C-alpha cells in the first residue's frame, strides 16, 4: 500500500505517479 | 527523495497529480 | 521585539499559535 | 575510614541500610545493591556511598528499581575482584529496571580489576554505557568473557540518539528563549514532542542523570513541548523553540532538550548547555499518538489506489 | 414520507465535485459515502450544492481533505442515520483534515447504529463541544474527536436550545448557530419525537414527520419494506443488507448477474436473509438459490492475499466474518485504547482453523485472545519467520489467551513465540505449550522468561501468615513455609507493606511502581533448608519503621527462578490489614 | 518478650543469623 511504498520506504516519482489517473 | 508520510504524503501526491486527480477502482 | 513578543511571533511561526 | 564488612557481603536495600557505610573510604568484601524505593531522598544514597573508592569483592546490583544512575558512588574507582560472584563476575547488574546511567565515564575511571562483567536485563541501560564500562574497566582489553546480552539490554530505551545543537540562546533576567536545530525522525509523526530539561546549576559539572531516581526525586524541571508544525520544504523547517519562564536573575541554568518519540529508537538529545540568564500514563499518550498515526496510515493505504 | 427517493451503491467522490451529482436523487446509500481529496473546490462550489434527499447511509461516511466545504448543513441537511453496517476502520462518521470546515451541520443526524465518530485535524471546526454525542451514538468513549479548532482555540458557539448535563454546566447543545441539537425525552431514546415532542412509532429510528405512524417516519430502526418500517421481513421477503426486504426475484436476479459476469457475490439465501456467500457448512442447491447444509464438511474457507491478513480494526476483522477456515496466516494488530473485543468476537469468533501462523503484535487494548470462540488449529503450513506458528509480541494489556480450562487450541507444526506481553502470565503461556502440543514434540519455543507477565500478579499458590505479632512501631510477621518443586528456584520472598487506613486496598497489580503511596517492597532472602521435609522453618520478617495508631496492608510474594521446567510460578498471600499498637 | 527478641530468635531459628 501507499504507506509501505512511500512512507515506510522511499517512493520514486514514478511510484507516486502510479497512484493517479 | 524523502519519506512521504502523514499529510505530506497527501500534499506530495497532490502536487504530482494536481488536475489529473487521484485514482480509484 | 521583546523576548516575550518575539517568542509569541516564533510560536506562530513554528507551532502556529498566534496572539 | 576503612570498612571491613563483618558479613563480607553487604546488601544495601534502603537509605537506612546504606548509613552503615557512611564515611567508608574503601569497602572490603563484596557489595550487593537492591535499592528499591525511597522518599524525599535528599541524595542520601550519594552521601553514604559517595566516599567509597575501592571495593574488594564484586559489585552486584539487582532488582534495583529506584536507582536511575550509579553516580551516587561519586568516588568509586576500583573493584578488586578479591571475591568474585559465581561466574567470576566483578560487576553484576541484573534487572535494574530504571538504571539509565551506569556511570559518567567522562569523569569516571572505575577499573573492575579482576573477573568478568555481567549485564542482563537493565532495559533502560544502554549498550553504549555497558561497552564504555568494559573498556574503561579493562575487562574487554583483558579478554574477559563479559556476559552482556544485546537482547534485553537497551530495549525500551532511547539509546544512541542523534545530537541536537542549540542554535539560539536569548536570555532575560527571568526568561530564556531557546531554539535548537530542527529534528525529525524518518517519519515526522514519530516526533510526539520534545522535552526540555533545565536545572539551576552553578557548576559546569552537571550530568543528565545526576540527582535523579525513579522513585520520583528529580532535580530537572522537565518541560514537555509539542511538535512543531512541519514544513514540506526541508529548508523551511523552522528551528523549534521554547521560552522557559520564571527564572532568577544572574543564575546559571544547566539545560538540555530531548526528543519524545514513539517506537517503530529514532530520537535526539542535546548536550547540557549553560546559560547565565541576565544580570503508566505515558504509555497511554504514546499509544494515542501511535493510534492516530495508525488510522492516518490506514486511511492512506485505503484511499490511495495504485492504478493496475 | 419514508425514503421517498432512490437507493444507491457505495459512493466514492474524489478530485472533482462533479461526481456528487450521483447523490442528486439518492435517499439511502447502500455503501460507504467517501467524499475526499477535493483540493480544487472553493466555498463557491458548495454554495448551491445540497442533497436533502439523503437520509441514511448503510455503511460509513468519510470526509477527508475537502476544501471550501464550510459546514455539512449545506450538503446533508436531512441526513439522520449512518447505519455503519460496514465501517471504515472502527468508525462510521469520519471527518479528517477538513481544512475549511467551520461547523458541523448534520443537525438532523440522530443515530449512528454501529461504529464510532472520528473528527480529527479539522483546524477551523468549532461547534463540536456543543454536540451531545451520547444522543447520537451509544459508544461515546470510542468516539475520537481531537485536533480541531474547538480543541486549539476559543469558539464563539452562541446558539440563541436543549441543554444537557453531559457537560459540567448547562451548555446548550447546538450543531450550528442556526440549529439546536434534537434532544428527545429519555423514554424515547432511539426513535425520537415530532416537533411538538409526541414520540414516534417504535420503528422510527431518529425522527418522524407524524407521530406513532410507521410510514410517516424518517428512518427504520430495523427494516424498510414497501414504504413502511417493519420489525422483520415477512415471507417471501428475504432480508437484504440488514436494512431492507427484497423478494426472491430480486435476489435471483442479483445472483445471476454475478454469475454471468463479475466485478462479485452471488446473493444466496440463508436464514431468511440474502447474503454474499453461502455460509460455512452450507452449499447452494438445485439452482434454487437456497443454502442447504452439506453432508460432509464444507467450511467457508477464506483465502488470504499472499498468505497474510492483518486485523488492525473492526473493518479488517469484519472482512473475516464467518470465515470458519483461514487459508492463510493471521496478524492481529489492534491499536488504540479502545477495546474491540466484542467486534472481534462477532467476526473472528467463528474461525475454527488457521492454516498459517497466528500473530498478535502491538495489540494494546486486547486483554484476552478469547474473542476467537472456536479456534482449534494453527496448521502452521506457512510460519512466521523463525518457524513460529503462534507469535505474540509487545501486547501491552494481554492478560490471558484462550481460557485453557475450556478451549483447546492445537498447532500442527511450528514453534511458540512470546515476548513483551507484560500482563500475560507465563502460567497462561505454559498451559498453551501443553494444549498446543508443541511441548509434546519438544518445539524449542521462543518464549521469554522475563518479558511475559512481569507486570502482572503471577503467583498461583498461596502463602498464609502463620503468626502476626505487633508493637507500637514494629510488626513481626511469619507465614507458612514455601519452596518450589526445587527449593533452589526460590530466590527469596518479598514483603509488601503500605498504610491502609481503610481496608479497601486492592491487590498488587504487578507493576512495582515506586510512587509516594505505593507498596514498600522488602526483599527477603529465603530461610535455611532444615530438619524434616515438613520444612519446619516458617519464614518471617520484622519491620521497625511503623508508627502507632496506624493500620497497614501487608502481603508476601515469593521470588522464584523461572525455567524451561515451567513448574515454578510462585506463591502470594492475600492482603492482611494489621494494626500497630498505640502509645503516647 | 519483645518483638525484637522473638525476631532475633526467629533469625537464628530460620535464617541462622545470631548476635
Ligand atoms: C441508535 O439506534 C439503534 C437502533 O437501530 C439503537 O441500537 C440498539 O441499542 C441498544 C443499546 O441502546 C443495543 O444494545 C442494541 O444492540 C442496538 N441494536 C442495534 C440493531 O443496533 C441505538 O441504541 C441507538 N443509539 C442511540 C444513541 O440512540
Ligand atoms: C578483607 O578482610 C580479610 C579478613 O579480615 C582480610 O584478610 C583481607 O585482607 C581484607 N581485604 C583487604 C583488601 O585487605
Ligand atoms: C574463575 O577464575 C579462575 C582463574 O581465572 C579459574 O581457575 C576458575 O575456573 C574460574 N571459575 C569460573 C566459574 O569462571
Ligand atoms: C560539581 O562540583 C561541586 C563542588 O565544586 C559539587 O557540589 C556538585 O555536586 C558537583 N556537581 C554534581 C552534578 O555533582
Ligand atoms: C436522477 O434523476 C434525474 C432526473 O429524475 C435523472 O436524469 C438522473 O439520471 C438520475 N440519476 C442520477 C445519478 O442523477
Ligand atoms: C419484487 O419482485 C418483482 C417481480 O416479482 C420485481 O419486479 C421487483 O423489482 C421486486 N422488488 C424490487 C424492490 O425490485
Ligand atoms: C477439548 O478437548 C477435550 C479432550 O480432547 C474434549 O473432550 C472437549 O470436547 C474439547 N473442548 C472444546 C471446547 O473443544
Author numbering:
A (entry chain A): 1 to 21
B (entry chain B): 3 to 27
C (entry chain G), F (entry chain H): 0 to 18
D (entry chain F): 310 to 573, 578 to 592, 690 to 718
E (entry chain E): 1 to 160, 169 to 271, 274 to 594
From the manuscript:
The human insulin receptor (hIR) is an [αβ]2 homodimeric receptor tyrosine kinase that upon insulin binding signals into metabolic pathways that effect glucose homeostasis. Insulin binding brings about extensive conformational change in the receptor extracellular region that in turn effects trans-activation of the intracellular tyrosine kinase domains and downstream signalling. Whereas biological activity of both Site 1 and Site 2 peptides in isolation is minimal, [Site 2]-[Site 1] fusion peptides are IR agonists, with the most potent reported being S519. Here, we present single-particle cryoEM structures that show how a 33-mer polypeptide unrelated to insulin can cross-link two sites on the receptor surface and direct the receptor into a signalling-active conformation.
